[PDB]
Design a protein around this ligand. Structure first.
Ligand code: NA
Length: 178
């Protein structure tokens, strides 16, 4: 695991322990961005605010998929670009959810959808560089989002935050490959 990959799953568990003690409403309020200004502090806060909502329906298969994505990303890009991708997509989702009037729409699916969008841009740019590893990541992310569309009551309500995260992912991809 890259240093950023371990921090990710560990921070989820650290926050999950806070929720067990203090309740999710209090913990979400603790980690919510202080404003909508696009600065490093608020982007990092949006990332932690997203993590508050991660343990709910967080399977070992979902964890392994995240690990596989992190490994692939780190093989192709500097580590700092992964942090920026996660923070920028979490912030975009949060800002849009807040505008819609429900910050609880900052759901894990927003991050999975952003990772899928990033991979789809990579596939478009490097059509002669596809590998079984990439093809499997794309397939598994599509299947995860297909299962959420079928079984998560909030999928439709989260359309706008998901779209904002996907657009942020596309913008980061264009930055990382120019
Ligand atoms: Na699942």
């Amino acid at each position: 695991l890259s240093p950023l990959a371990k921090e990710f799953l560990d921070e989820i568990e650290r926050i999950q322990a806070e929720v067990a003690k203090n309740g999710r409403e209090a913990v979400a309020e603790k980690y919510a961005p202080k404003s909508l200004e696009d600065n490093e502090e608020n982007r990092e806060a949006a990332y932690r605010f997203l993590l508050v909502n991660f343990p709910d329906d967080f399977s070992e298969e979902d964890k392994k998929l995240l690990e596989d994505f992190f490994k692939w990303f780190s093989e192709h890009f500097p580590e700092e670009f992964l942090k920026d991708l996660i923070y920028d997509t979490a912030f975009a989702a949060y800002v849009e959810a807040k505008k819609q009037g429900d910050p609880t729409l900052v759901l894990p699916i927003t991050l999975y959808a952003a990772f899928l969008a990033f991979l789809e841009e990579w596939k478009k740019k490097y059509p002669e560089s596809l590998t079984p590893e990439l093809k499997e990541l794309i397939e598994k992310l599509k299947e995860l989002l297909e299962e959420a569309e079928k079984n998560d009551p909030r999928y439709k309500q989260a359309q706008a935050p998901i779209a904002a995260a996907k657009e942020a992912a596309k913008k980061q991809f264009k930055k990382y490959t120019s």
